[PDB]
Each structure stands twice: as C-alpha cells, then as structure tokens.
Design an enzyme around this catalytic site. Structure first.
Site, mmCIF file in Angstrom:
data_model
loop_
_atom_site.group_PDB
_atom_site.id
_atom_site.type_symbol
_atom_site.label_atom_id
_atom_site.label_comp_id
_atom_site.label_asym_id
_atom_site.label_seq_id
_atom_site.Cartn_x
_atom_site.Cartn_y
_atom_site.Cartn_z
ATOM 1 C CG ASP A 21 -1.979 1.055 0.997
ATOM 2 O OD1 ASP A 21 -1.834 2.080 0.239
ATOM 3 O OD2 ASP A 21 -3.080 0.765 1.543
ATOM 4 C CB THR A 22 2.297 3.375 -2.788
ATOM 5 O OG1 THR A 22 1.083 3.484 -3.541
ATOM 6 C CG2 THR A 22 3.102 2.244 -3.334
ATOM 7 N N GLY A 23 -0.059 4.287 -0.542
ATOM 8 C CA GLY A 23 -0.710 5.305 0.184
ATOM 9 C C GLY A 23 -0.851 5.161 1.696
HETATM 10 C C1 LIG Z 1 1.654 5.856 14.176
HETATM 11 C C2 LIG Z 1 1.039 7.243 13.959
HETATM 12 C C3 LIG Z 1 1.739 8.157 12.922
HETATM 13 C C4 LIG Z 1 1.301 8.106 11.496
HETATM 14 C C5 LIG Z 1 -0.201 8.320 11.234
HETATM 15 N N1 LIG Z 1 -0.328 8.298 9.808
HETATM 16 C C6 LIG Z 1 -1.462 8.008 9.211
HETATM 17 O O1 LIG Z 1 -2.487 7.839 9.943
HETATM 18 C C7 LIG Z 1 -1.462 8.025 7.725
HETATM 19 C C8 LIG Z 1 -1.666 9.419 7.194
HETATM 20 N N2 LIG Z 1 -2.553 7.197 7.210
HETATM 21 C C9 LIG Z 1 -2.370 6.476 6.145
HETATM 22 O O2 LIG Z 1 -1.350 6.496 5.419
HETATM 23 C C10 LIG Z 1 -3.496 5.520 5.810
HETATM 24 C C11 LIG Z 1 -3.187 4.127 6.336
HETATM 25 C C12 LIG Z 1 -2.823 3.933 7.744
HETATM 26 C C13 LIG Z 1 -1.411 4.247 8.161
HETATM 27 O O3 LIG Z 1 -0.519 4.223 7.331
HETATM 28 O O4 LIG Z 1 -1.199 4.616 9.351
HETATM 29 N N3 LIG Z 1 -3.749 5.525 4.384
HETATM 30 C C14 LIG Z 1 -4.932 5.354 3.877
HETATM 31 O O5 LIG Z 1 -5.956 5.136 4.614
HETATM 32 C C15 LIG Z 1 -5.065 5.508 2.388
HETATM 33 C C16 LIG Z 1 -5.599 6.879 1.955
HETATM 34 C C17 LIG Z 1 -5.068 7.997 2.764
HETATM 35 C C18 LIG Z 1 -3.770 8.354 2.496
HETATM 36 C C19 LIG Z 1 -3.100 9.358 3.221
HETATM 37 C C20 LIG Z 1 -3.807 10.038 4.190
HETATM 38 C C21 LIG Z 1 -5.137 9.669 4.453
HETATM 39 C C22 LIG Z 1 -5.784 8.662 3.753
HETATM 40 N N4 LIG Z 1 -5.950 4.473 1.848
HETATM 41 C C23 LIG Z 1 -5.699 3.018 2.048
HETATM 42 C C24 LIG Z 1 -6.977 2.158 2.100
HETATM 43 C C25 LIG Z 1 -6.614 0.688 2.330
HETATM 44 C C26 LIG Z 1 -7.834 -0.228 2.262
HETATM 45 C C27 LIG Z 1 -7.459 -1.630 2.452
HETATM 46 C C28 LIG Z 1 -8.963 0.182 3.219
HETATM 47 N N5 LIG Z 1 -7.763 2.338 0.843
HETATM 48 C C29 LIG Z 1 -8.901 2.934 0.848
HETATM 49 O O6 LIG Z 1 -9.282 3.522 1.887
HETATM 50 C C30 LIG Z 1 -9.605 2.962 -0.454
HETATM 51 N N6 LIG Z 1 -10.747 2.039 -0.429
HETATM 52 C C31 LIG Z 1 -10.929 1.148 -1.303
HETATM 53 O O7 LIG Z 1 -10.152 0.844 -2.216
HETATM 54 C C32 LIG Z 1 -12.220 0.404 -1.216
HETATM 55 N N7 LIG Z 1 -12.564 -0.246 -2.473
HETATM 56 C C33 LIG Z 1 -12.140 -0.679 -0.173
HETATM 57 C C34 LIG Z 1 -11.049 -1.660 -0.150
HETATM 58 C C35 LIG Z 1 -11.219 -2.722 0.934
HETATM 59 N N8 LIG Z 1 -10.416 -3.924 0.747
HETATM 60 C C36 LIG Z 1 -10.735 -5.105 1.302
HETATM 61 N N9 LIG Z 1 -11.842 -5.250 1.882
HETATM 62 N N10 LIG Z 1 -9.896 -6.137 1.234
HETATM 63 C C37 LIG Z 1 -10.029 4.397 -0.844
HETATM 64 C C38 LIG Z 1 -8.788 5.323 -0.772
HETATM 65 C C39 LIG Z 1 -10.805 4.436 -2.167
HETATM 66 C C40 LIG Z 1 -0.506 9.747 11.698
HETATM 67 N N11 LIG Z 1 -1.368 9.842 12.696
HETATM 68 O O8 LIG Z 1 -0.050 10.784 11.095
#
Ligand SMILES: CCCC[C@H](NC(=O)[C@H](C)NC(=O)[C@H](CCC(=O)O)NC(=O)[C@H](Cc1ccccc1)NC[C@H](CC(C)C)NC(=O)[C@@H](NC(=O)[C@@H](N)CCCNC(N)=[NH2+])C(C)C)C(N)=O
Ligand SMILES: [Cl-]
Ligand SMILES: [Cl-]
Ligand SMILES: [Cl-]
Ligand SMILES: [Cl-]
Ligand SMILES: [Cl-]
Ligand SMILES: [Cl-]
Ligand code: NA
Lengths: 99, 99
Positions: free
Chosen positions: B25-27
């Site tokens: 997951d690059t995002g």
């Molecule tokens: C430890 C804490 C520090 C870091 C913490 N960082 C985060 O919270 C960062 C910003 N979040 C992220 O990077 C999170 C993942 C969690 C994580 O990495 O922690 N990323 C994400 O949630 C990114 C989008 C995003 C990107 C950046 C910012 C916000 C949102 N999407 C990933 C997510 C994965 C999926 C399996 C549910 N995809 C979706 O949400 C997409 N949904 C879909 O594709 C749907 N079809 C459902 C798929 C379900 N699959 C399944 N059932 N098998 C949507 C974007 C169309 C912070 N608080 O700053």
C-alpha cells in the site's frame, strides 16, 4: 518516473482546468478527490476506508491528466484527508511496483 | 518482483514468526494488521484514513520477513478492512513505483 517511497508519492493531476495534487495509492481500488467539481449527474456511492465509510459522488469515464499522461476513468468526489489516485487509473499509466 | 496493478497487490509476510497476507500500500505511511497478536509492550496511537481515525497498538521492534528480506520494524495492530504493508517497510525493500 521511478518514484521511491521515502516520502508520500504525490503527483500533479489536472481535470478540466483544475490543477491539483494527489497520492498514488496502490491500496486504493478507486480514485477519490475532494477539491474538484465535475458537471452534471452523479451516482451516490458509499465507500470503505480504514476509518469508516464515506459518501461520495461517482462520475464515470472522466478525462484526467496524471503527471502529464492523459487517462480516462471513474472519479469519486467526496471527503478525504488526501486526494487519492487508485489502481483504476494507475493501470492506465502502465504503473508497476518494483520490490 | 515487478508487478502490475490490475489486481490488488497482495503478498504473504511473516510477522513475529506468523504468516499473514497483506496489501502492498503506497498510500499508507505505516503497516497495519488486524488478524494477529504480538508479544510484549506497546504504545497507543491513532491512524487516520478516509473514513476517520482508529485506535491501534504500536509495536516497535517486530522481526518481519518480506520478499526475501529479514527486517525489523514497527507494526500497528488494530481494525482494518485489509491488512496493509506501508512505506515504512516498502522503503526497506528499496521499493519503487514506475511508470
Ligand atoms: C503511528 C502514527 C503516525 C502516522 C499516522 N499516519 C497516518 O495515519 C497516515 C496518514 N494514514 C495512512 O497512510 C493511511 C493508512 C494507515 C497508516 O498508514 O497509518 N492511508 C490510507 O488510509 C489511504 C488513503 C489515505 C492516504 C493518506 C492520508 C489519508 C488517507 N488508503 C488506504 C486504504 C486501504 C484499504 C485496504 C482500506 N484504501 C482505501 O481507503 C480505499 N478504499 C478502497 O479501495 C475500497 N474499495 C475498499 C477496499 C477494501 N479492501 C478489502 N476489503 N480487502 C479508498 C482510498 C478508495 C498519523 N497519525 O499521522
Ligand atoms: Cl511525506
Ligand atoms: Cl507530477
Ligand atoms: Cl447530466
Ligand atoms: Cl468500497
Ligand atoms: Cl477505534
Ligand atoms: Cl518501521
Ligand atoms: Na520485539
């Protein structure tokens, strides 16, 4: 380009004259933008993210330019903390992950 | 490997000696699993995605085997629709996005 992943993989997009940035997300099936308008009717859809469900507008067969490459596909408009480019449009760029 | 994105990019990984599947997951900044118990101490954090925020346990110093590499890194355990491998681990593979 070849994009390493030390920072978030953000690229420029353009949709009918709106120039924006979005994140290339290989964990997204779909493309979701917040800060864009598109004309005419849409289909209301609920989609799943990591934090819950969100209501979006679905627009089909939208022309969009991603990092200067013209592609066509479904764009969802709704709330998101980051504009997201999903697999639906990344496949049109011929994108690969190399690991 | 070099993979296209016509399907979800799912791989098997060994986390703390246990095998699970997860989405590359690059995002995602971080690696988030829900089907697994890990040992020892953790810290409470919150992650944000499309739908809102979820509470997770942050486990540092977890041994992981992925794509032939043996690495130590952080894993967040909490509820997610899919297990996801984020940039914290992809960078340790030298992973790139190409188009
Ligand atoms: C430890 C804490 C520090 C870091 C913490 N960082 C985060 O919270 C960062 C910003 N979040 C992220 O990077 C999170 C993942 C969690 C994580 O990495 O922690 N990323 C994400 O949630 C990114 C989008 C995003 C990107 C950046 C910012 C916000 C949102 N999407 C990933 C997510 C994965 C999926 C399996 C549910 N995809 C979706 O949400 C997409 N949904 C879909 O594709 C749907 N079809 C459902 C798929 C379900 N699959 C399944 N059932 N098998 C949507 C974007 C169309 C912070 N608080 O700053
Ligand atoms: Cl960044
Ligand atoms: Cl760009
Ligand atoms: Cl219309
Ligand atoms: Cl969905
Ligand atoms: Cl929660
Ligand atoms: Cl890490
Ligand atoms: Na440990």
């Amino acid at each position: 380009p070849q994009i390493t992943l030390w920072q978030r993989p953000i690229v420029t997009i353009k949709i009918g004259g709106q120039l924006r940035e979005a994140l290339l997300d290989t964990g997204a099936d779909d493309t979701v933008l917040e800060d864009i308008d598109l004309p005419g009717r849409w289909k209301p859809k609920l989609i799943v993210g990591i934090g819950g469900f969100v209501k979006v507008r679905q627009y089909e067969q939208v022309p969009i330019e991603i990092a200067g490459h013209k592609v066509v596909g479904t764009v969802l408009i709704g709330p998101t903390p980051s504009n997201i480019i999903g697999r639906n449009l990344m496949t049109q760029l011929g994108a690969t992950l190399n690991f």
